């Protein structure tokens, strides 16, 4: 079974902590989801007529 | 109208010089003056404002 061969278990770890916790991650971190546009129709400070 | 037919002396005549001597007190208002300067105060007001706005 070459899963048991130990000599190579280093040449497997590495990479894949390297894809796994560096690139994967900022590959996410990159794909941003903004907020949806919300046009606000009620926003009108007026002060009270003056009077 | 009464010069002939008030008999009486002089009432009719007295009468009507102190009515023609009689002078009505036309009274001033003494009001207005105010209301002027309350508007111009006002107009200074609504001036700035609508400068602001």
């Given at each position: 079974?070459?899963?048991?061969?130990?000599?190579?278990?280093?040449?497997?770890?590495?990479?894949?902590?390297?894809?796994?916790?560096?690139?994967?991650?900022?590959?996410?971190?990159?794909?941003?989801?903004?907020?949806?546009?919300?046009?606000?129709?009620?926003?009108?400070?007026?002060?009270?007529?003056?009077? | 109208?009464?010069?002939?037919?008030?008999?009486?002396?002089?009432?009719?005549?007295?009468?009507?010089?102190?009515?023609?001597?009689?002078?009505?007190?036309?009274?001033?208002?003494?009001?207005?003056?105010?209301?002027?300067?309350?508007?111009?105060?006002?107009?200074?007001?609504?001036?700035?404002?609508?400068?602001?706005s």
């Open positions: 079974m070459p899963q048991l061969n130990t000599t190579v278990w280093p040449t497997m770890i590495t990479p894949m902590l390297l894809t796994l916790f560096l690139i994967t991650q900022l590959k996410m971190l990159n794909t941003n989801y903004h907020l949806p546009p919300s046009p606000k129709p009620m926003k009108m400070k007026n002060y009270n007529k003056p009077w | 109208y009464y010069k002939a037919n008030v008999a009486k002396a002089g009432l009719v005549d007295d009468f009507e010089k102190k009515f023609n001597a009689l002078k009505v007190p036309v009274p001033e208002d003494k009001y207005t003056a105010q209301v002027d300067a309350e508007e111009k105060e006002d107009v200074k007001s609504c001036a700035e404002w609508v400068s602001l």
